[PDB]
A paper describes a structure:
The periplasmic chaperone SilF has been identified as part of an Ag(I) detoxification system in Gram-negative bacteria. Biophysical and biochemical analysis of proteins comprising the sil gene cluster has been limited to date, with sequence homology used to infer function and the proposed resistance mechanism, after comparison with the more extensively studied cus and cue systems. Such analysis is consistent with the model that the SilF is a periplasmic metal-binding chaperone capable of binding both Ag(I) and Cu(I) ions and shuttling them to the SilCBA complex to aid metal ion detoxification. The protein has a β-barrel topology composed of five β-stands arranged in the β1-β2-β3-β5-β4-β1, similar to that observed for Cu(I) chaperone CusF. The X-ray crystal structures show that the metal ion–binding site is formed from strictly conserved residues His63, Trp71, Met74, and Met76 located at one end of the β-barrel.
Next, we determined the structure of SilF38-120 using X-ray protein crystallography. Unlike CusF, SilF38-120 has an additional 15 amino acid α-helix positioned between strands β3-β5. In CusF, this is an extended loop with no discernable helical or sheet secondary structural elements. RMSDs derived from the Cα atoms are 0.99 Å for Ag(I)/Apo and 1.09 Å for Cu(I)/Apo. Larger deviations are observed primarily in the metal-binding site, the top of the α-helix, and the final loop that leads into the C terminus. Recalculating RMSDs with these two regions missing reduces the value to 0.68 Å for Ag(I)/Apo and 0.98 Å for Cu(I)/Apo, showing that changes in flexibility is confined to the binding site and these regions. Although we do not see appreciable changes in helix formation from the crystal structures, most likely due to crystal packing forces, both of the solution experimental observations are well supported by the simulations where changes in helicity are clearly over long simulation times between the apo and holo SilF. Together, these show that the capping helix is unstable in the apo-protein and indeed could be unfolded to a degree in solution, as observed for CusF, with metal binding stabilizing the helix by an as-yet undefined allosteric mechanism.
Author numbering: 14 to 92
C-alpha cells in the first residue's frame, strides 16, 4: 500500500499543498509515466521538493493512494 516512485518536480502550490512530479512508470499500481500531483503533510517534504524544483535533480518518493489524493510519505532529492 506504500508505493515508491521517481521523477522530476515541476511545480509546487503551498495553498493546495501539492507537488507536481513528472514520474516514471510505477508497475506496482500499473501507472504509466505521467505528471501528477502529490500532497505533502510536513514542511521538510515541501523544502526537499522546493530544492528539487530549483535544481531539476531527480527525486525518489513514496506515497499511499486516497482516490484523487496521492499522500507523500517520504521524499529524497539526489545531487
Ligand atoms: Zn526537519
Amino acid at each position: 500500500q506504500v508505493i515508491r516512485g521517481s521523477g522530476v518536480v515541476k511545480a509546487i502550490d503551498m495553498n493546495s499543498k501539492k507537488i507536481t512530479i513528472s514520474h516514471e512508470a510505477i508497475p506496482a499500481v500499473g501507472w504509466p509515466a505521467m505528471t501528477m500531483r502529490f500532497t505533502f503533510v510536513n514542511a521538510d517534504d515541501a523544502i526537499d521538493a522546493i530544492n528539487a524544483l530549483k535544481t531539476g535533480n531527480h527525486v525518489d518518493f513514496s506515497f499511499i493512494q486516497q482516490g484523487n489524493i496521492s499522500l507523500l510519505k517520504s521524499i529524497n532529492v539526489t545531487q
